[model samples]
Each structure stands twice: as structure tokens, then as C-alpha cells.
Target chain A: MHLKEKITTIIQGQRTGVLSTVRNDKPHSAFMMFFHEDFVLYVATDRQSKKITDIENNPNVHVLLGRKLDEDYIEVEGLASIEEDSTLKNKFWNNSLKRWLLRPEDPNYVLIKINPDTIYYIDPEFLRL
Target chain B: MHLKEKITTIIQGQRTGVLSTVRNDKPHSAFMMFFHEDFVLYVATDRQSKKITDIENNPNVHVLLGRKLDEDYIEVEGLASIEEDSTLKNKFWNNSLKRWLLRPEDPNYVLIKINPDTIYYIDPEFLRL
Candidate 1:
């Protein structure tokens, strides 16, 4: 399979991970509902959250995209722009979450995207980490 | 002097490791010239390189900053924007580099900056990885 296929499999395999970001002086972290493409990663959250706050202060973020049960996964390093565009919301939105976001019109709804620099995925058989 | 100082120590101690990135088709592999700070890690390079092309194609990147001499640094996930901003160029430009870049005006002079999301420090001597 192609790398994108393998990544799609990885993304479909899990929905959450520790999304981490660095600000001026320290590290800020939070659990996130992440979305992934072949090379881009997204996490949806509100602007008030520290994660979003960190993004505004600084857009760079590192997401530990991994299996909850296994360490085999990747590290996503990219910019986390707080995209509130409805199209993005719709594109990444889940029908199940439409209600909590309340009409898909809530201004608080945010989609932070990451364009990864390097990804380290330790497959079950990949040799020596 | 806390974070940067600590990080300066980390950078001075560690030198080599895998710097990975997602290219158009497959992931590209490379060893890099990585520099670190309180909120950044810079990889200086010649603009004609592949890593630079990847940045040109997509400036987003994830840098696995670690103590290979130790595996205890952090994952710098951020937008890998190509910066030749003279102020930035001067601030980050190394005096030692005057020979390689030849002069501040040399065309190939490049500094890729990563605005990090999360940094995980292992400090192998301090804790479990």
C-alpha cells in the first residue's frame, strides 16, 4: 500500500492523542480529537483552550499521533492555524458532533491544521527505533 | 537563561539524527544541521537542497529534536517557513557560518524555522523513555 493509505489506516485506527505545542517559555499540551491526511493533521478545539491560545501566541505544534494501545505511530510537526471556516468545519465535521457545536455556526468551533515536517511511525515490524 | 540555557546545553551535546519529512510521493530522509533555542530549532542549509525544496513545496514540518547522544530532547512540531528575513537572518545567522554562506548576501543562505507545538525531553539520565 502507498504511504497515504498506511496513514489513512493509522488515522482511521485512532481518534485521539496528546497534542502538544510550545510557547515562549514552556510547553503546553492537551488531548485532542485529531484529523489526518497523507501529510496534514488537524485537531478541533475552541479558541479559549490553552491549545488554541498557544496557537495564537504561536502556531507551531507537535501532535503525538499514536495508537492508544501501542507506541507505534507518528509525530506531526506543523503550523496549527485556528480555522473557523465552515467549509473546514463541514469537511472535518462529524454528524454526531453537529449538535454540540450547535448548528455548525458556533464561533467557538475551531479546526487547527498541522503540516508535518517529520513523521516517525514504528510499524509492528519496522526494525530498530 | 532557563529554557534557552538548558537547551543550549542540549544542542551543544547532541549532533546527529534522522530529520524526516513528507515529500510529494514518499517520505524523504535526511540528516540535518539543527540548531535549538527556547522556542525554536533551526536547520541551516543550502537552498538548492531537497529539504529546502520540501519547504518550498510545503513549509510545514515536524522535527524530532532529541539527544541522540541521549534521546532526551523534544519533538519540535511547527511551520518550517524559509526565513531569510535579515533581522532573523542576522539574529540566527552564526558568525562561524560567514565562511560557508560566504557573506550575508550569498543567495543560498537559508534558515528554516520551526515554531514548535510540543517538546518532549527524555533526559535519559533523569527518567524513563
Candidate 2:
């Protein structure tokens, strides 16, 4: 039971998670951008995005990728690097993402990629075997 | 507006966060154990805790300590080490923790001390300045 594999299965099946970023001296809760697999997680955010600025000031971050009650989640703790690569960008582009962006290259079209140092995953007990 | 102050304000009031962990190659999620402050975060978990075991196997972890909605919260990425120290244990002991413990030290009287690598905090828009 490779925990990462189990997490990937759940991520592939779910749609969202809360992304918490810190800025200044306050905590900011953002519902935007997250994609995870293979024990790795990435978020499509902005270059000058407040969260990105926070990342610049401090790269330590935690991503909550699921509801808190029962099943399916990825808690990713890692350093984030900005990804300007067109290929990686294209790999995650989706039509539904338009809710947050006008276009993939939207100036805010920056990708804040999180390279997870560690991840904890939980799915429904049924999947435990 | 110290980030810790803002976060403690939020934690002192809020009740939950979605906890994600990986077990046996699959994702497992449970709404359990988390508390945060200026630069440190603590979790009331079992020593033989599955997540503790996972932490022992690997010391890295990510914690999402907020709602996805617009508000104050903390996302902590850090190392989790067990706390059996009596005074430190008493420092964090709380009434709400009863739901998880059958008895303290029941092969599970374990506390997880997470020294965050970096903290990202977000508060309501009005507080951003």
C-alpha cells in the first residue's frame, strides 16, 4: 500500500481542497488551485500573487487537499518554486480553471509549484486493504 | 499584526481542519489533532498513532489548519516529533481532546510537536494591510 499511490487515486477523483497561505501577520485561506500525484503537489497561482509573495518571504507551506471529516486528502508540507515552464503549465490546464483565470497565460498565470517534503494521505477505510 | 497573534486569534475560536495522511499507498483522512501559534504547532495524537508511525518512518508533514472560506488560518509544514515531557504535555492538555484518548499514555499518550519549516497565514481582506 504505497500511501502516495492511494492518495493519487483519491486526488484523481476529487475536485478541491483548501489552500492556506500566510501573508504579513495574518492567515489567508484561498480556495484556488491545487493538483497532486506521486507524492507531489502543485498549485497554479500568480507570480506576484500575495501567496507567492509570502512564499518568497518564506517557502514553508502546507496544503490541505480535502474535507476534514472522513475521506480523501493530501496534507503537503514543502518548499515552493515558481514554474514558468509551458509544458508543465499545459500539463495541468483545464477548462474549469477559467473560474479563476481568464486564460492560462493570464499575467497572473504564474504557477506556484509546491515540491512536497512530505505528504500524509487518508482515504475511506474501504480502500485500506 | 503578528502572524502568530492573528493565527492564535483564529485558532482560539475555530474548531477544525481537514487532516490528510498517507497509509499503505492510499490516502486516509480524519478530522483529528491540531493547534497552532506564533511559530509552533501541536497535535494531540497517540504515540503508537498510525500517523505517528508514519512520522517516525518519515519526519516530514503538512498541516492545513483552516476553512477554505475567506478568513484567518495557518498552514504548517514541519517535522513532527513526539512529546512525552510532562510539563510540555500539561502545557497543551485540553478538555476537547478527550474524544481521541481512552487514557493518557495508553501506548498512545503521544503528542506531536511540529516545528514549522515556514508558516503561511491568511486573514480576512480587511486585515491585509
Candidate 3:
């Protein structure tokens, strides 16, 4: 398969990954639920979340996805921006998110759009099964 | 349990995590095999790996561990240093690592010691079961 196809497969196969943002010139990482449209990724978060603040300070971000024990994963280098589009909020909404946002229409509901600058498909030769 | 005990439990319960390092002032992240003694974490890698270079340029780093779907995870902020100590190489060695290092004594074998400055046990209320 093509590299793009492989990355797409990985991204679509998983809904959770680590998103790393800059904090005081250092890195801060957390696992976040993610959804994507082609290569562009989206994460639902609270408007008041620290990550929103982090992105405001430094939009450049790194994401790790498709991780399984001793298997391949992708490193995504991207820029992140906060989005409050109602269309997106509803599009990305799920019952699972109710514990946080209550509903898609909740004012605190926001989304992070990640536009990838580069995506590395890392197949660790040493870890090949 | 005390906060220290909780952090220890989380760290000791997991062996793989995302290690984020600085790259040209941007966050770079990847999955790594880890082990720890108390709050100090250790990761083995090749001496010439990009992470070694990243740490050399900026010792500050961030790590995410103990992630499970809709469960709690830990975020660790720390300083990283490269170690070539033979004692540590052997102590951290495992047969699974043979594909990369050949043996613990291989010159390419090195370890990264992360002395955490702060750790946050993120029990996401929104994600609690």
C-alpha cells in the first residue's frame, strides 16, 4: 500500500493518541481522543482547557498514534488551532463525550484542528514481528 | 494512598509510553520502552538515536504513561541525560531488545534517565468509568 494509505489506515483505526504541546519552552503530553478527515485531524476539548492555552502560545505540536506493543506508529508534526464551529462540534460529537461537554451545543465545547506539516510512519525494524 | 505512592503505582504498572523531546524548539514524540526505580524513569536506545541528540540539545522532556481507554494516565515532566554506564546497560537489558542492541554490551546500547521534576496523576473526571 501507499504511504498515505498506510497512514490513513492507522489514523482511522485508532481514536486515541498522545498530543504534545509546548509549555514554558518544554514539552507537555497527554492522551486525547481524535478524529480525522483525510490527513487533517480533530480533537474535541473544552474551551478553557490548558491545551487551548498551550496552542495559543505555540501552535506547533507533535502527535503520536497507531501504537500497539512492538508495532508501528506514526509521528505527526502539525500546527493546532482552536475551533468553535458548531458544525464541527456536532459532527464530532458522541455520547461518550457527554461526561465532559454535556452536549454538542455546550458553550465550553471546542475542537482542535491539526494540520500536519509532516507525518512519519515509523516501522521499527528492530521491532518487526 | 499518598500522591507519591499513586505516582509510583502508575509508573511501575506501565512499561511503554510516549517520550516527547524538543526538536528545533518544537515538540517531537515517540513510543518507548521504559522502566523505573521510584520516580526516576529509564529508557534504552541506540547511542546514535535522534532522541540522544535531542536530549543533548535540550535536557528538558515530557512523558505520558499508563493510558487506557477512558481511564487515568500520568504526565511526567523531567530532565533527561544520556548514560553509557555498563552496569545500567546490563540492568536494563532484555532479550526483546536484542534485535536492536545485539547485547547489552554493544557500544550502540545507551540509556536515558529521566529524573522527574513533577508528575500529575490525571484522573479525568470526564473519562472515569
Candidate 4:
């Protein structure tokens, strides 16, 4: 399969990922729920979350998806921007999010749109027979 | 449970994580197999991996472990250093690594020891009932 197809397979197949951002001159990471379209990823978050501050300080971010040790995983280095558009919020919103967010229009709700600079498809060759 | 205990539980329970290093002023992350003692973590890799260069230029790193969206996860911020000590190498060596390194003494094999500056125990409260 093509590398692009492999990357898409991991991205579209997974719902959770680790998102890393810069904080105090160091990298800070968190497991986050992600949605993507055409390789562009979106994360729903609270406007007041620490990640918002991290993005404010530095937009460059990295995301890791598909953690299976023997299978494939993807490393995405990208630029992140805070998005407050209601249309995007509503589009990505789901009932599972109601635990933290009251609705798509909740004032605390925000979206993080990540545009990838590089995407690596890693198929670990360990255990090659 | 105590925060320290929660952190330890996550650290001791997981073998894989995302390790992020600085590259071109952006955070670059990859899935890694990890071993830990106390709150310190270790990763074995070839000396030629880009991560080695990233550590050489900047030792600061972030690691995210335990990806279950509703369960506990950990965010560890730490300083990394390369270790080539034979004893340490043998201690971390295992059969699974044979695909990458022929022996614990393989010249290209090196261990990255990470000492945490801070460890955060995150239990997502989303879906509180």
C-alpha cells in the first residue's frame, strides 16, 4: 500500500492520540480525542485548557497515533490554530463530549485544527522473520 | 488513591508511550517502548536514530503513556541523557530487541535515561455519572 494510504489508515482508524505542545521550553503531551479530514486533524478542547495556552505560546505541535507495538503507527508534526467557528464545533461535536461540554455552542468549547508539516508512517520491522 | 500511586500504577502498567523531542523548533513525537524505575524512564534505541541527535541538541522531552480516553494517563516532562554503560544496556536488553540490535553490546545500541522534572497524573473526568 502507498505511504499516504497507510497514514490515512492509521489516522482514520484511530479516535485517540497523543498531542504534544511546547511549554516552559519543554514538550508537554496529553492524550486527546481527534477527528480528521484529508489528513488535517481537529481536536475539541476547552478554551481555558492549558493546551490553549501552549498553542498561544507556540503553534508547532506533534501528534502520535496508533500505538500498537507490533503494528503501524503515525507521527505527525504540524502547526495548530485555535478555532472557535460554531460550524466546525458543531460538525465535530458528539454526544460523548457532553460529559465535558454542554453543547457545541458552549462558551468554553473550542477546536484545535492541526495542519501537518510532515507525516511519517512507521511500520516497525522488529520480529522480521 | 494517592497521586503518586496513580502515577506509579500507570508507569508500571504500560510498556509503550509517545516520546517527544525538539526538532527544527517543533515537537516531534514517536511511539517508544519504555522501562522505568521510580519515576525515571528509559528507552533503548540505536545511536543513529534522529532522536539521539534531538537529545544531543536538547535533552528536554515529554512522554505520554496510557492512552485509554476514559481511563488514567500520565504526562511526564523530563531531561534525557545517553547512556552506553554495559550493565545498564544488559539490564534493559530483551529478546524482542534482537530485530534491531544483535546484542546488548552492539555499538549502535544506546539507552536514553529520562529523569522527570514533573509528573502529572491525569484521570479524565469526562463521562462522570
Most DockQ-accurate candidate: 3
Provide the global lDDT of candidate 1 against the true structure. Answer: 0.59
Worst 10 residues of 4 chain B by lDDT: B120-129
DockQ for every prediction shown: 0.03, 0.06, 0.77, 0.64
Ranking by TM-score: 3, 4, 2, 1
How well is each residue in B1-129 modelled by candidate 2, as lDDT tens digits?
576566666657665764444343233334565665445667777666687776666565655666523456766556768877766566666767676666544455667777767666755322221
TM-score against truth, every candidate: 0.44, 0.51, 0.90, 0.88
Each prediction's fraction of true contacts recovered: 0.00, 0.00, 0.82, 0.69
| Model 1 agreement with the true structure over A1-129: per-residue lDDT tens digits | 555556556667777656666444344444456776556777666657766666777666656655522245665555667677677777777754553366456777877877776555545322111
Per-residue lDDT of A69 in model 3: 66
Q: What lDDT, from 0 to 1, does candidate 4 have? A: 0.81
Candidate 4 C-alpha RMSD relative to the actual structure: 5.3
Please tell me which predicted candidate would have the highest lDDT against the true structure.
Answer: 3
Q: Which stretches of candidate 1 lie over 4 Å from their true place?
A: A1-3, A68-71, A95-100, A124-129, B1-129
Cα TM-score of candidate 4: 0.88
User: Which model, 3 or 4, shows the larger TM-score?
Assistant: 3
What ordering of candidates by DockQ runs from best to worst?
Answer: 3, 4, 2, 1
Candidate 1: residue A28 Cα off by (Å):
1.6
Maximum-TM-score candidate: 3
Interface RMSD of each: 10.0, 9.6, 0.7, 1.0
- After superposing candidate 2, which stretches have Cα over 4 Å from the reference? A25-28, A123-129, B1-98, B101-129
Q: What is the C-alpha lDDT of each candidate?
A: 0.59, 0.61, 0.82, 0.81
lDDT of 2 by residue, A1-129 (tens): 676466676566655665554444333345665775455567776566787887776566656665524456666556777887787677888877675666776766767777766666745322221
